[PDB]
Structures are given as C-alpha cells and as structure tokens.
Amino acid sequence: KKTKAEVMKEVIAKSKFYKQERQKAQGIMEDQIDNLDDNFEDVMSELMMTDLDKEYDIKVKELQLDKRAAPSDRTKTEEEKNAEAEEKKRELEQQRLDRMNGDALLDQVKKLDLDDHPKIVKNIIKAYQPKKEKLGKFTAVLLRHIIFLSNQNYLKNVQSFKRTQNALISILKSLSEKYNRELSEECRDYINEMQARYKKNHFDALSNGDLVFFSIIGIL
Amino acid sequence: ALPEKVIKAYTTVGSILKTWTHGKLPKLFKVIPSLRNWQDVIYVTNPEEWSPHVVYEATKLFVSNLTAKESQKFINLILLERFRDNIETSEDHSLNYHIYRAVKKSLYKPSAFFKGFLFPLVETGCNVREATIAGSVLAKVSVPALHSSAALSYLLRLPFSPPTTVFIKILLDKKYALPYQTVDDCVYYFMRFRILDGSNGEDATRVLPVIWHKAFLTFAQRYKNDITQDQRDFLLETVRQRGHKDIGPEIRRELLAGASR
RNA sequence: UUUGUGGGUGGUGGUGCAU
C-alpha cells in the first residue's frame, strides 16, 4: 500500500503538470493569435518616448588614451617553491625509471652577416620571432646551419669557437624542450640523407659535423 | 487611459509570463523589439511580478536586440526592482541564478550595465550582501575594459559607502588597466580618505573595514607602476596613519619597492 | 564583440562549538 501510494502521488504529479502546462499553452496561444497583433498595432498607434554616464564616457576616453598593465600574482615561499621543484624532480625521476624499464635563406642572411656575431643575429631573429611554425622551421634550418658551419671550418681557437658553439647549444636546449617534432622529423630524414650518402660512398661523406650530430642528439 | 485592447492584452501576457517557467515566448513579445514603445508596453504588462526564467528571457531579448539608452532605462527599472525583489524575498538573501544570468547579459551589453543597474544601486544604497553578489558577477563576466575602468573612475569619484568599497575592491582585484588619470581619481579618493593634518572630514577620519584593507593591498600590489611618486609617498602617509595588523607592511613593501612611470 | 599566441580553477559550499 505504501509503494502504491507513492506511485499514486507521482500519477497526481504528472496529471497536474500536464493539465496546467496545457492550460498555459492554450491561453498564451490565444493571446498570441488575437490580442498580440491587437496590442502591437494599438501600442504602435500609441507611443513611449548624468554625472555617472558622463564619467563613464570620460573615463572610457581616458582608458583609450592611457591603458597600462603589469601582471603580478602572489609571491611564493622558499620551502614552498623548493619542495614543489624537488617533487617535480622526483616525478621526473619516476618517469625516467618507468621509461628505462618500459636552408639557403638562413645561409644567405647569416653568412651575409658574420658567424662570430651571427650567434647574436640568430638569437635576435629568434627574439623577434618569439615575441609557432616560424619558430619550428627556423629551429630546423638553424640545426642544419650549425652542422654546416661546423663542417665548414675549424680555424678558430678555444676562445671563439667553443663560446659560439656552446651558446648556440644552449639555444638548442631550450628550443628542444619547447618544440620537438620538427627536430624529430629533421633528424629522422637526416639519418636518411647520411645513410644514403654512406651507401653512395662509405667513408667519403663522414666528418666531424655528422659526428657532432651524433653528439648533440645524444645529449638532447 | 490607453485602449482597452492594449490594457487587456498586456496584463494578460503579464499573467501568461507569470504562469510561465518553461516553454517558449509569444508572437507579441518577440515583435516587441520590432517596435519602439517598450516603456508603455511593459508598463501595461506590469513587469515586476513575473518568473525568473521570464526575466531571464526578457533580458536576453533586450540585450540581444536593443541599444544603449533603452537598455539604460530598462535595466535600471526592471533589473533593480527584480534584484531587490529576489534578494529581500529570499530569507537567507540568495539570488536566483537566472536573475544572475540577467545581470550577466546586462554586463555583456556594452553601455547597459553602468547606465542602468550598478550606479543607481550605489545611489539607492544596497546592502553588503547585494554588493558581494554583483561583485562576484563582475568577477566572472567581463565588459569592455574601457567601460570597466570607467566604472572604477566614477565609483572612486562618488562618495564612500561599504558597497562602494566592496565594488572597488572587486574591480581592483579584477585587474584591468589603470590609466594615470584614473589613478588621479583613485588617489583623490585616497586623499579624501587619509587624515589632513587643516580641514578634517568624516570620510577623512571614519572607520574603514578589512575588505577595504584587501582593496588597499591589491591597489599597491598590482598598480604600483602608475602611481606617480607623489602619490607613492602619499600612500606611505595614508598607510602609516591608518595601517593594519598583517596586511599593512605588505602594502608598505609593495609601495616602496614599486617603481613607476 | 571575436580571432593568432601565453594562463587563473575548487567553493552564491555543508558544517559543530564558544560568544
């Protein structure tokens, strides 16, 4: 009887909602069919026609004249950021263990300049660019040109060869940890090109540039 | 003394959009934005007794279709009456989220929100509950930054009230652009707040609670680059004569270690 | 108002208890 009662209650509910919504539907449609057009025509036969807003307009003009921004969220505690970073290092450790177990355009611009400051020219080019696809394509032809110059000369000494190459390599690091797929397909078809060159001639296409290609990929 | 057909039709569509809480809208009400005489129309419909979904769809209609000053008069009358109506009808002072949505559409329409609702509310003195409500709406939804900083400048020019300082806390934490003329307005507010060691004042000496303290913290926090250096050491004097217990020295560090334009 | 590029996320929270 209790279960039947609850069901009777729901029946009463559905009945009430259906009948009332029907009534509202009938009335709304009736007015919408007659009194609607009536009211529209007759009210149209009729008619119907500052410090705050002044300050609003004035300060909007002011805003257009002088927008200014500098984002700054709440600073972070020493132990807070340090432990978050230590934990991020732990997460990296875990991911590593789990993984362990289971061109001519660039050439023309840069050689038109000068290598010993084309480090700076390229960094600037990248700065301008970083202020997606621009970045990726330039990074690819950058690694190409790195191989190129390192296979072009070994005249400079520890003072001007090492510094250029190592600052470039730091740029390589950061661009790698941001974009990688362009680098990946670059180096994949790079293996293709160098294996085809080996098959053409085994030793007449291998050099310090391809050796340092091995080196940079192995540390990247 | 209007025609009886307008009278009957608009009061009966008023009862129709009283009995409405679900469904669709009339041919009359969707040709109302095809006309001009909305004040007379809705004053014969007697708007202030409808349903939350009904005020929802009326606001959706007028914000989607109409323009600035019509939105001003409509939003002032209708939304102020319905906003006060909903809050003081709810015993724990809660607003229906469909009327909150009406407020959201009022923000979304460009010159509809400050001309219609918020500023006559500041004149008519809402309670701190309604102040916090409209502040949460202003947090979630965003108008053009020009209009938002305009609301900032005019509320800092208008006198102090607890809704005034709660709203200005909401804007300064909403983190839009602060022009140097606007920081003229804001530090003018602040020099009518501080102590004038010859003509003192009620706004210059009265009691100023902790939400205003959070507002002072976010002002000197985000906006230290637009306060000119006279405004900087004036904020120094302000915070030293009216400091706080744990917010104040944070304001002082932000204030001195801020460089500006 | 939207788009090309970076990004905020728990409380229109329940909640005892003492004033």
List strands and helices in order, with pairings:
This is part of a larger assembly, with chains A (220 residues) and B (261 residues).
Chain A: H1 2-33, H2 35-45, H3 51-66, H4 78-101, H5 104-113, H6 118-128, H7 133-152, H8 161-178, H9 181-200, H10 208-219
Chain B: H1 4-19, H2 27-31, H3 38-45, H4 52-65, H5 68-89, H6 97-108, H7 113-124, H8 128-140, H9 145-157, H10 162-174, H11 180-193, H12 202-205, H13 210-222, H14 229-241, H15 248-256
Helix pairs in contact in B: 1-3, 4-5, 4-6, 5-6, 5-7, 8-10, 9-10, 9-11, 10-13, 11-14, 13-15, 14-15
The structure holds one RNA strand of 19 nucleotides.
Explained architecture:
The PDB classes it as ribosome. Keywords: ribosome, 90S pre-ribosome, Dhr1. The structure is cut from a larger assembly and holds chains A (220 residues) and B (261 residues). Chain A has 220 residues and is mainly α. Helix content of chain A is 79%, strand content 0%. Chain A has 10 helices and no strands. Chain A has helices spanning 2-33, 35-45, 51-66, 78-101, 104-113, 118-128, 133-152, 161-178, 181-200, 208-219. The longest helix of chain A has 32 residues, at 2-33. With 261 residues, chain B is an all-alpha fold. Chain B has a domain at 48-186. Chain B is elongated. The relative contact order of chain B is 0.07. The chains are: A mainly alpha (220), B mainly alpha (261). Chain B binds one RNA strand of 19 nucleotides through α6 and α8.
Which descriptors would you attach to this protein?
part of a larger assembly, 2 chains, A: 220 residues, mainly alpha, 79% helix, elongated, B: 261 residues, 15 helices, 69% helix, RNA-binding, ribosome, 90S pre-ribosome, A1 cleavage, Nucleolar complex protein 14, Essential nuclear protein 1
